[PDB]
Design an enzyme around this catalytic site. Structure first.
Site: not given
Ligand SMILES: [Cl-]
Ligand SMILES: [Mg+2]
Lengths: 241, 231, 244, 235, 250, 195, 243, 240, 111
Positions: G30-31
């Protein structure tokens, strides 16, 4: 062919992992250069900051090992910092044990011996770096000593390292053929830095701004790196001549 | 393929196949369900037998007076991890006179499982765990995976056909979360949840295993005739 | 991990053989021949140096024949460096025994212990075996004159006359032909040299390509003397038997 | 090669699964649990007629209240039995009481997975651990090299296991007497054994609360064999 | 972590060869030519200083090394391997001899200790053999002057004269013609320079040649006076000037 | 423990050892044999600290018996004594040393000679014609200096030994409850039952 | 070939393929981002809501080291936790010996050397995380990003994960438009926007926003989580910008 | 330390290293054990490709573990020395603590336990040796004969053989040995042992070793002439 | 020199009936001539109907009770919630005390 995976001999007596560690040296695509003055030793290296989000002050391949010794690295930064931390520890321990500052050439030998161990012992890989140590030694005077992944080391009148190292090397060779001496006959370190940058410009064929270079200077009893403004001041002097 | 010989090797797409194969052992394991309200937390576990002559493999283990888990996969690995939890819960009590937070319990399991996935020689744990507990911040339910990933949830299920119970709990979320001050109704919801993962077989008296912990309820396990109420 | 690069030196073949031991023996078969002959009044050790160069210092050299103590010597066949590791161990073991019991070590005990060390390298540790075969020549007051041999497997046996190294097949046939039990040392000296002279891969057997030694009771009254032959002494004994 | 503690793509430990194949090659061992006691019986399987069959020790005492039968690479069981015996006696020393059959089995099964790169490989032997305690009464446990153990009313392990287990499925009920169980083990052993069953190539044992663990004599087993043959011919 | 390589990396092949030792010898073959000649009153050891770059100071790199006051060493093959061997060889001379007997070891025994170190790299766990052949020249009271060769296997042989490395085959043939048992030290130095010129291709002078002797005691190099029994080191490294003097009368 | 004597004569070694085992103000036993047979022609008597004595004697016995089986050969009395001395020499610089003094009487079959060795707990070995440990020596040495002859028979040696025991029974403060006498010769070890 | 089968092995290029393979695991994650500001730093992360059954606000991913350093990472979450556990040990021993809390550059090298050490042997696996971290020390604010190889640099803005290129582009605009500097409270709001914009590269599952910050003025030089009114204010700002 | 798991399971459930150790035993010289009514006899083959041997000093095939127990073997000679040494040490250790010499069963059980340990210990290969252990328990006149093998299993035998061509001599013993009536005397037991070896050996010269063990530490090795008399007697009865 | 032991005073008393048992103890805690607490209990319910007191040096007493309480807890975990009988508890406590035979718990224990 597992003789190419670990540091054991190939049929032709070669260590491929050592040879491939040499190729990792140029992974950063940076060229370094070192020359000696009368009172000083100057080392310069290209500084390439491609990402705009990077803090350019933290991007460095020159290290202050001890008060007197400086070191520039050609190779990836993780291995560079690994080598730097060890060199710092070794130089500190040497002073504590033997009661005097570790000489540049002795540190170079010590780091070279460590590099040699990785070429003989299997569980340790070689570091993909070439270490150029510089100082003004209290016995030998201005000194340049360079270490590689093979565990080889030697003193230099001057030297260069990187992808376009050969062009810089011959450029320096031709100067010392002409000058007929082992060093840059110059009083102030400022002009030795100017010489270093000038000859790098001629060899590489590129122009440099203040943020395209990184400079280290060794004098008696201290080694120090130059700021962007110190280099800019130096670039102005070259341009006005 | 060439990158599944040990846990220390990454695949070209950045996968750890030994960890994924350990994850596969959980999918083969018998279904177990976890769910909680604000007052209580409940484990429901479908036990498995070798044959009609054999006993039913015990799925639920007590860790402390206020905490315990259910297992799915390699049972010996669950025994190792549960024993580690018992010690950590116990260390917290003896040294700090403090009941171990269910969240810290999860953090400790994560870190223990992780070390096995980065070192040569060792192997990942081959079991998934559902930890329930009641601590100073109310009721809790955790899901442990042997990759190291621990997750706090309102409800969940692991094992074979766990997707059926997990979908049910995802629908029932708003109902069972507000079953406060009522143990039997929260269990009923869990028993109905695990029923969505059943195929051909149904819940019998020596097949079903239920555990509960809550505000004024120590972690206690129900087996045999004690679970006949809920069939 | 490191498993990938493990040769597994201490395992069995499907046939029930130890790969590394068999290959170590193959190595030894190319080494310079060494012969031991046991007589009733002494023992002879003879060994052929590996293809000598004319600029090799011959008198201050030791390749084949080594002294373990005053009563025991060995002839080497294989890797010299490996042999010297084992020789220093054997020399120490002899002194430990003397220190403990105030008596010189019986030959077999020394041989067994050295052979037990070799055995260990074939069963555990994951290291390569010692590429060495010894001929032990020695004397004690229990069995008198004794000849033994050990090899990389750690197996040892006793002999009246024996060869190790190159051309043992041919050498053993020649010894088996001319050897007899009532033989004297001076006769054994002649047999040893004659055998080497025929089995040698060289054109002609000369003094500079030989090491020689005798263990006699030829000292004064009931005591044993070791004689490691000098170059000039080998030259004379080679002329005396009529080989050169 | 490959790691000893490696998982297969299906999520099983290769070495544990291969050790299970070794156990299938082993001689048959059967256990039946009743309310009057637990019976343990084994196939001796002498490799040659010159071998003195009474020296074949495949049924073993752990404590007075716990017995054990084995199948597979039986040499591997020696250190397991040694551990079980020490565990049983040690618990008695620490707590002045008999140790629970389940607790004993659990202690033995803790050794099972202590292998890797601890010992070099899993055990190549399965154990039937039978016993009695005051809490859970007469119990029979099947201890595998996977570290797992199941309680059984009746269980067969070894080469004739799947055939014998199917037979035990039909025959076992909760009101079996000890005598009925003894005959049932003999009956099922005779079916799956290669050579003809007698007192010399098969051994019986039992554990009762009153008399503890007892291996039967060849004279006692022979009468049960004779009693068995007569009862089958009688209908 | 930890060194998991506890097994041999050098093993016997079916043919009986020790591959890594053979390959180490191949690395020595590629190495620059070095040689040693024994005279009646001394020993000479010599080699070419192959410069990696003209900017490099070849004085800082010493191929010929003092081990004890009366023993010197030179090599052919991998320089780094040689450098650590010299460090270990110097230390073992103290730990395993001088600190016990209060005097420096004789040549043959120091050679034996170096050989032991190189043999262990052939058999120990997780290491390759050393990729060098050493030539060790030395003097001691009871053995006089001596010259030894030490190979990657750990084997060592005494020589009257020999050469190792690049053009060793031709150099050994040259030495056979010139060597006699009545050579004086100055005659051996002369032959050494002649033999080495054949293998050297580029410049041939005191700056590209490294040469040392084991000869008479040097009281001037001792550093102190007052102890009659202490007379100074027999090992002496010839200067760049001293070599050029002999190259004129060549 | 307390009294152990040894006399080497022409063809044998004779060891006399007291039978009393006292602790506090109680003689616990009056028939104690303070000796072990190390090999068929080698006998070791011992005296010293309680527990240490037997533990040491049996440890030596086991080692010598192990050697005999391994080599199918009997170690000489000289060799055994040197082994024992070394064990004591190690012991004295241990954390807790064996406080045991020993006499080793043996018949060397190769030399056809009896041999008597006296070794104290420090590892101090001596070969002697006659020996003793503890306070006994203060009486017996001077007595034997006078009456001993090197060419005596076994019977003469026993009479000489009786003379020692009589003197000890007369002048020693403690009751040591007589002695067990054993003879080591070419035919091995045997015990004198009436002394 | 086979150069990619073992860690610490150089390929003929001079590359360690196992480290590059670990980077792929980071790219999969994920970012997560980091924004350096006037007198501190701001960290933010994308938390994919896999299911309704996930308890909101109770699967915290951002971690604190000592009392003044914040750490966030993308990739294998357990590997990140292991790295932080080490960081906490390193920071504790520094404070123990030298009294002062560990400086951020000092702390950065401690993680760097540790991660780099896991590229030196075949008996260990490289870290499957890129770690964005930083805080406030005696010399002011510092932001760092550390990669599987052990490589780290100081940053004005940093981003890693599946939406790194989207986040980097958005970060580069902030650096250009604010040369004098960005304030702490602004950076929190911008961090929210950038996570929301970077969520376009992971838009199947909807997500949960998590922000933390260190600031000499706002948090007194200590690491704190952004919660309640300040968090909802930042979420609303981000919601307004996507539409 | 070297840790490698050398002895491991294969897909079919076999430990190949243990099975390949059995092949080494099959290569070894034949050894036979026959126990009579009041004795045990250990017979051993010695291959005749080795002439110029010195039989005085050459290690004997049958080894004494204690004064009342013996051990012969088939397989790797170097490996056997290690087992014999350990067994001899345990024999003395047992006398020291129990104040009684080992039983033959106990000594066998120990040697078998050592062999087993090497089949699931890291860094070691199994012993390429099977042993025949024979003797008499202290104060007992019942003969004891046991066999061990690399795997670690052990068992008692009325008569047994191991080594090369052992299946041929086992075939012989299986029909010639009567359980109801074992060799009543020493002569009968030795003869049956020599007969069984003569099925395989070649010549009855210096190829057969015979060791007789009787109760109360009564062990003696037969000489060439003594054995040759049995060989001469058997051949004359054969021609019929 | 540092003395690791102290005397916290007090006294305890155990009496057994036919179908019951009492374990009494005063609540005073002292060092030398000073009162530390007038109410510091030293008789504890350890579970499974076992009461325990370790009187003498309170630090050692509390340490022992704490260890035994923990022993009861693990007895349940390891043996399927089985009740620890008073005779088994006694034997367990012997091993706890004797484990420190050469640096003793300075307490007189009663259960
Ligand atoms: Cl160094
Ligand atoms: Mg004395």
């Amino acid at each position: 062919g597992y003789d190419r995976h670990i540091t054991i001999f190939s049929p032709e007596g070669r260590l491929y992992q050592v040879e491939y560690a040499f190729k990792a040296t140029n992974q950063t695509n940076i060229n370094s250069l070192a020359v000696r003055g009368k009172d000083c030793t100057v080392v310069i290296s290209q500084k390439k900051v491609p990402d705009k989000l990077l803090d350019p002050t933290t991007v460095s391949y020159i290290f202050c090992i001890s008060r007197t010794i400086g070191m520039v690295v050609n190779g990836p930064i993780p291995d560079a910092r690994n080598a730097a931390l060890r060199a710092k520890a070794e130089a500190a321990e040497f002073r504590y044990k033997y009661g005097y500052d570790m000489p540049c050439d002795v540190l170079a030998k010590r780091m070279a011996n460590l590099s040699q161990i990785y070429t003989q012992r299997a569980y340790m890989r070689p570091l993909g770096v070439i270490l150029t140590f510089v100082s003004v030694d209290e016995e030998l005077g201005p000194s340049i000593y360079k270490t590689d992944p093979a565990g080889y080391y030697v003193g230099y009148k001057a030297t260069a390292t990187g992808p376009k190292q050969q062009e810089i090397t011959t450029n320096l060779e031709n100067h010392f053929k002409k000058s007929k001496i082992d060093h840059i006959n110059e009083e102030s370190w400022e002009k030795v830095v100017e010489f270093a940058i000038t000859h790098m410009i001629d060899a590489l064929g590129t122009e440099f701004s203040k943020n395209d270079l990184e400079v280290g200077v060794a004098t008696k009893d201290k080694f120090f790196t130059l700021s962007a403004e110190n280099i800019e001041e130096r670039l102005v002097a070259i341009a006005e001549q | 393929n060439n990158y599944d010989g040990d846990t220390v090797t990454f695949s070209p797409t950045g996968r750890l196949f030994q960890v994924e194969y350990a994850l596969e052992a959980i999918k083969q394991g018998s279904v177990t369900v976890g769910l909680r309200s604000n007052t209580h937390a409940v484990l429901v576990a479908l036990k498995r037998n070798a044959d009609e002559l054999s006993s039913y493999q015990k799925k639920i283990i007590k860790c402390d007076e206020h905490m315990g888990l259910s297992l799915a996969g390699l049972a010996p690995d669950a025994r190792v991890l549960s024993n580690y939890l018992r010690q950590q819960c116990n260390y917290s009590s003896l040294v700090f006179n403090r009941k171990l937070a269910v969240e810290r319990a999860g953090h400790l399991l994560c870190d223990k499982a992780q070390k096995n996935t980065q070192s040569y020689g060792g192997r990942p744990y081959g079991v998934g765990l559902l930890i329930i507990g009641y601590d100073k911040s109310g009721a809790h339910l955790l899901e442990f995976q042997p990759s190291g990933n621990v997750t706090e949830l309102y409800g969940t299920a692991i094992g074979a056909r766990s997707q059926g119970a997990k979908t049910y709990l995802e629908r029932t979320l708003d109902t069972f979360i507000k079953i406060d001050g009522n143990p039997d109704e929260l269990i009923k919801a869990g028993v109905e949840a695990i029923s969505q993962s059943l195929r051909d077989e149904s819940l019998t008296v020596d097949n079903l295993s239920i555990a509960i912990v809550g505000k004024d309820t120590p972690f206690t396990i129900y087996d045999g005739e004690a679970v006949a109420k809920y069939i | 991990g490191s498993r990938r690069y493990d040769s597994r030196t201490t395992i069995f073949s499907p046939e029930g053989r130890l790969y590394q031991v068999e290959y170590a023996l193959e190595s030894i078969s190319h080494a310079g021949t060494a012969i031991g002959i046991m007589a009733s009044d002494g023992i002879v050790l003879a060994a052929e140096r590996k293809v000598t160069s004319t600029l090799l210092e011959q008198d201050t050299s030791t390749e084949k024949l080594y002294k373990l103590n005053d009563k025991i010597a060995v002839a080497v066949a294989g890797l010299t460096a490996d042999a010297e590791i084992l020789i220093n161990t054997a020399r120490i073991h002899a002194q430990n025994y003397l220190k403990t019991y105030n008596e010189d070590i019986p030959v077999e005990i020394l041989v067994r212990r050295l052979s037990d060390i070799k055995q260990g390298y074939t069963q555990h540790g994951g290291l390569r075996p010692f590429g060495v075969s010894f001929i032990y020549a020695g004397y004690d007051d229990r069995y008198g004159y004794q000849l033994y041999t050990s090899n990389p497997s750690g197996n040892y046996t006793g002999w009246k006359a024996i060869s190790v190294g190159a051309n043992t097949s041919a050498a053993q046939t020649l010894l088996q032909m001319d050897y007899k039990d009532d033989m004297k040392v001076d006769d054994a000296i002649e047999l040893a040299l004659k055998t080497l002279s025929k089995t040698t891969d060289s054109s002609a057997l000369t003094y500079d390509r030989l090491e020689f030694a005798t263990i006699r009771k030829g000292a004064n009254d009931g005591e044993v003397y070791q004689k490691i032959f000098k170059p000039q002494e080998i030259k004379d004994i080679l002329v005396k038997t009529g080989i050169t | 090669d490959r790691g000893v503690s490696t998982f297969s793509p299906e999520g099983r430990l290769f070495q544990v699964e291969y050790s299970l194949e070794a156990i299938k090659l082993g001689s048959t061992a059967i256990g039946i649990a009743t309310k009057e006691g637990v019976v343990l019986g084994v196939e001796k399987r002498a490799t040659s007629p010159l071998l003195e069959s009474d020296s074949i020790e495949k049924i073993v005492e752990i404590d007075r209240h716990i017995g054990c039968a084995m199948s597979g690479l039986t040499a591997d069981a020696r250190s397991m039995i040694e551990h079980a015996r020490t565990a049983a006696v040690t618990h008695n020393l620490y707590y002045d009481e008999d140790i629970n059959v389940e607790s004993l089995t659990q202690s033995v099964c803790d050794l099972a997975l202590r292998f890797g790169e601890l010992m070099s490989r899993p055990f190549g032997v399965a154990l039937l651990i039978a016993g009695h305690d005051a809490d859970d009464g007469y119990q029979l446990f099947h201890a595998e090299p996977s570290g797992t153990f199941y309680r059984y009313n009746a269980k067969a392990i070894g080469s004739g296991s799947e055939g014998a287990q199917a037979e035990l499925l039909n025959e076992w009920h909760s009101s079996l007497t000890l005598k009925e169980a003894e005959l049932l083990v003999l009956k099922i052993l005779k079916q799956v054994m290669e050579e003809k069953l007698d007192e010399n190539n098969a051994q019986l044992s039992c554990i009762t609360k009153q008399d503890g663990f007892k291996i039967y004599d060849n004279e006692k087993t022979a009468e049960l064999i004779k009693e068995l043959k007569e009862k089958e011919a009688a209908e | 972590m930890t060194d998991r390589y506890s097994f041999s990396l050098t093993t016997f092949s079916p043919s009986g060869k020790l591959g890594q030792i053979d390959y180490a010898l191949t690395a020595v073959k590629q190495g620059v030519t070095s040689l040693g000649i024994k005279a009646t009153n001394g020993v000479v050891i010599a080699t070419e200083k192959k410069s990696s770059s003209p900017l490099a100071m070849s004085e800082t790199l010493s191929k010929v090394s003092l081990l004890t006051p009366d023993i010197g060493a030179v090599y052919s093959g991998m320089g780094p391997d040689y450098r650590v061997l010299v460090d270990k060889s110097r230390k073992v001379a103290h730990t395993s001899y001088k600190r016990i007997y209060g005097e420096y070891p004789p040549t043959k025994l120091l050679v034996s200790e170096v050989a032991k170190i190189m043999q262990e790299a052939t058999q120990s766990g997780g290491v390759r053999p050393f990729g060098v052949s050493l030539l060790i020249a030395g003097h001691d009271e009871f053995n006089g002057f001596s010259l030894y060769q030490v190979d990657p296997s750990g084997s060592y042989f005494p020589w009257k004269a020999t050469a190792i490395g690049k053009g060793s085959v031709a150099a050994k043939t040259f030495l056979e013609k010139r060597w006699n048992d009545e050579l004086e030290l100055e005659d051996a130095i002369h032959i050494a320079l002649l033999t080495l010129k054949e293998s050297v291709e580029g410049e041939f002078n005191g700056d590209t040649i490294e040469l040392a002797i084991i000869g008479d005691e040097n009281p001037d190099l001792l550093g102190y006076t007052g102890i009659p029994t202490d007379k100074g080191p027999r090992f002496r490294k010839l200067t760049s000037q001293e070599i050029n003097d002999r190259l004129e009368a060549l | 423990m307390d009294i152990i004597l040894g006399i080497r004569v022409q063809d044998s070694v004779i060891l006399a050892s007291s039978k009393a085992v006292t602790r506090g103000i109680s003689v616990l036993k009056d028939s104690d044999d303070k000796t072990r047979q190390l090999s068929p022609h080698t006998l070791m008597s011992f005296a010293g600290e309680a527990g240490d004595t037997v533990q040491f004697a049996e440890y030596i016995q086991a080692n010598i018996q192990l050697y005999s089986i391994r080599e199918d050969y009997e170690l000489s009395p000289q060799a055994v004594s040197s082994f024992v001395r070394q064990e004591l020499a190690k012991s004295i610089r241990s954390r807790r040393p064996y406080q045991v003094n020993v006499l080793i009487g043996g018949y060397d079959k190769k030399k056809n000679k009896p041999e008597l060795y006296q070794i104290d707990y420090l590892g101090t070995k001596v070969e002697l014609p006659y020996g003793a440990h503890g306070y006994s020596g203060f009486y017996t040495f001077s007595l034997l200096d006078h009456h001993y002859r090197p060419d005596m028979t076994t019977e003469e040696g026993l009479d000489l030994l009786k003379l020692c025991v009589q003197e000890l029974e007369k002048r020693m403060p403690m009751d040591f409850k007589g002695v067990i006498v054993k003879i080591v010769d070419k035919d091995g070890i045997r015990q004198v039952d009436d002394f | 070939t086979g150069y990619d089968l073992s860690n610490s092995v150089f390929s003929p290029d001079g590359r360690n393929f196992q480290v590059e393979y670990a980077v792929k695991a980071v790219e999969n994650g994920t970012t997560s981002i980091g924004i350096k500001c006037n007198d501190g730093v701001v960290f933010a992360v994308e938390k994919l809501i896999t299911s309704k059954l996930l308890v909101p606000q109770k699967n915290v991913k951002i971690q604190v080291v000592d009392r003044h350093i914040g750490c966030v990472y993308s990739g294998l979450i357990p590997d990140g936790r292991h790295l932080v556990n080490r960081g906490r040990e390193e920071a504790a021993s520094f404070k123990k010996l030298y009294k002062t809390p560990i400086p951020i550059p000092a702390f950065a090298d401690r993680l760097g050397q540790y991660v780099q050490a896991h590229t030196l042997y075949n008996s260990v696996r490289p870290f499957g995380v890129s770690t964005i971290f930083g805080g406030v020390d005696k010399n002011g604010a510092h932001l760092y990003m550390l990669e599987p190889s052990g490589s780290y640099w100081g940053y004005k803005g940093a981003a890693t994960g599946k939406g790194r290129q989207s986040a980097k582009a958005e970060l580069e605009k902030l650096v250009d438009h604010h040369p004098e500097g960005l304030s702490a409270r602004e950076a929190v709001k911008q961090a929210a926007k950038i996570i929301y914009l970077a969520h376009e590269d992971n838009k199947e599952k909807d997500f949960e926003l998590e922000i933390s910050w260190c600031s000499l003025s706002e948090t007194n030089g200590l690491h704190k989580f952004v919660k309640g009114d300040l968090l909802q204010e930042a979420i609303d700002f981000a919601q307004k910008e996507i539409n | 330390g070297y840790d490698r798991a050398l002895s491991i399971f294969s897909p079919d459930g076999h430990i190949f290293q243990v099975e390949y150790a059995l092949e080494a035993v099959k290569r070894g010289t034949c050894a036979v054990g026959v126990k009579g009514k009041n004795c045990v006899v250990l017979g051993c083959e010695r291959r005749s490709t080795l002439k110029l041997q010195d039989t005085r000093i050459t290690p004997s095939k049958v080894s004494k573990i204690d004064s009342h127990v013996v051990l012969s073997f088939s397989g790797l000679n170097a490996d056997s020395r290690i087992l014999i040494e350990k067994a001899r040490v345990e024999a003395q250790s047992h006398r020291l603590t129990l104040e009684d010499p080992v039983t033959v069963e106990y000594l066998t059980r120990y040697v078998a336990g050592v062999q087993q340990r090497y089949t699931q210990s890291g860094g070691v290969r199994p012993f390429g040796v099977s042993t025949l252990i024979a003797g008499f328990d202290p104060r007992d006149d019942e003969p004891k004969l046991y066999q061990t093998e690399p795997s670690g299993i052990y068992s008692s035998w009325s008569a047994q053989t191991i080594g090369r061509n052992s299946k041929t001599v086992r075939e012989f013993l299986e029909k010639n040995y009567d359980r109801k009536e074992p060799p009543a005397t020493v002569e009968e037991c030795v003869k049956l042992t020599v007969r069984s070896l003569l099925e395989v050996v070649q010549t009855g010269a210096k190829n057969i070793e015979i060791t007789v063990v009787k109760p109360d530490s009564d062990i003696v090795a037969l000489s060439s002439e003594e054995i040759n008399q049995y060989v001469t007697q058997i051949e004359q009865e054969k021609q019929e | 020199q540092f003395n690791p032991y102290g005397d916290n005073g007090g006294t305890i008393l155990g009496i057994a009936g036919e179908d019951f048992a009492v374990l009494a103890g005063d609540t005073r805690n002292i060092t030398d001539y000073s009162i530390n607490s007038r109410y510091e209990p030293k008789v504890f319910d350890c579970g499974d109907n076992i009461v325990m007191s370790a009187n003498g040096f309170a630090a050692d007493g509390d340490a022992l009770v704490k260890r035994f309480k923990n022993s009861v807890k693990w007895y349940h975990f390891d043996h399927n919630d089985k009740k620890l009988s008073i005779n088994s508890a006694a034997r367990n406590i012997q091993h706890l005390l004797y484990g420190k035979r050469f640096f003793p718990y300075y307490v007189h224990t009663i259960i």
